[PDB]
Ligand binder design. Structure first.
Ligand SMILES: O=C(O)c1ccc(-c2nn(C(=O)c3c(Cl)cccc3C(F)(F)F)c3ccccc23)cc1
Length: 241
């Protein structure tokens, strides 16, 4: 009946609503794998057509994350500057965590455009180092067998973090962070899943992967810019110069 147990239900709701695909849909489609003809078709496409495809899927992913943040109790109550600071540093980190749901650790494939395919699908992009890192991060995260409420609460904490440089009302972020930590700890105790806390990825790993990802995305956006209808215009202008 506590203010925290509600916070749990509310975070789980925002997440359920901003969830692009349902987990059992992703799990059942684990059989639906791209054929060598389909893989070759992706590999033979231009760098620029594979880029427009991936950039549009990644922008859509960020927009679901912005909506997940918007629906978190207290997020709107922060000043616009703090909202930008938190989403600029964390939105893509959330997108990267969420990918573990579309990842199949057995055949090392990811759900991309209706079917499951390996990293070979992305050859055309010519950044096999970054793509291998993304797949390796999803592969490590998959061993935790994250549940839907775990991903929800963990991703809310990835976003609500008072240790992001440039925050104005720092104590207002701390107040939201500490409530979400309590919700996360409380929830893990209730379900006997406190063991995942020791297995969680180090804060630096995520931060590092994401900065590399976003810089590679920024280079591609400079060379071949895609156009997106901004869900959060002040955030969009902070990433798209
Ligand atoms: O709809 C919006 O308001 C919105 C929509 C998307 C963002 C956003 N894009 N982004 C990218 O990395 C990105 C993507 Cl996903 C595709 C193509 C180019 C880019 C790049 F130019 F920024 F590099 C981000 C990283 C971190 C945080 C927010 C965002 C921001 C706002």
């Amino acid at each position: 009946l506590t203010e925290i147990e509600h916070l749990v239900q509310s975070v789980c709701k925002s997440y359920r609503e901003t969830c692009q695909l349902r987990l059992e849909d992703l799990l059942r489609q684990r059989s639906n794998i791209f054929s060598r003809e389909e893989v070759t078709g992706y590999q033979r496409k231009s760098m620029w057509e594979m880029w427009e495809r991936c950039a549009h899927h990644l922008t859509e992913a960020i927009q679901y994350v912005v909506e997940f943040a918007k629906r978190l109790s207290g997020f709107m109550e922060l000043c616009q500057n703090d909202q930008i600071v938190l989403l600029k540093a964390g939105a893509m980190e959330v997108v990267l965590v969420r990918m573990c749901r579309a990842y199949n650790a057995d055949n090392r494939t990811v759900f991309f455009e209706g079917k499951y395919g390996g990293m070979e699908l992305f050859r055309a992009l010519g950044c096999s180092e970054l793509i291998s890192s993304i797949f390796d991060f999803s592969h490590s995260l998959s061993a935790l067998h994250f549940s839907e409420d775990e991903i929800a609460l963990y991703t809310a904490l990835v976003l609500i973090n008072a240790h992001r440089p440039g925050l104005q009302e720092k104590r207002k972020v701390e107040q939201l962070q500490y409530n979400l930590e309590l919700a996360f700890h409380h929830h893990l105790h209730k379900t006997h899943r406190q063991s995942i806390l020791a297995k969680l990825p180090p804060k630096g790993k995520l931060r590092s992967l994401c900065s590399q990802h976003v810089e590679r995305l920024q280079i591609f956006q400079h060379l071949h810019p895609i156009v997106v209808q901004a869900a959060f215009p002040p955030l969009y202008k902070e990433l798209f110069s």
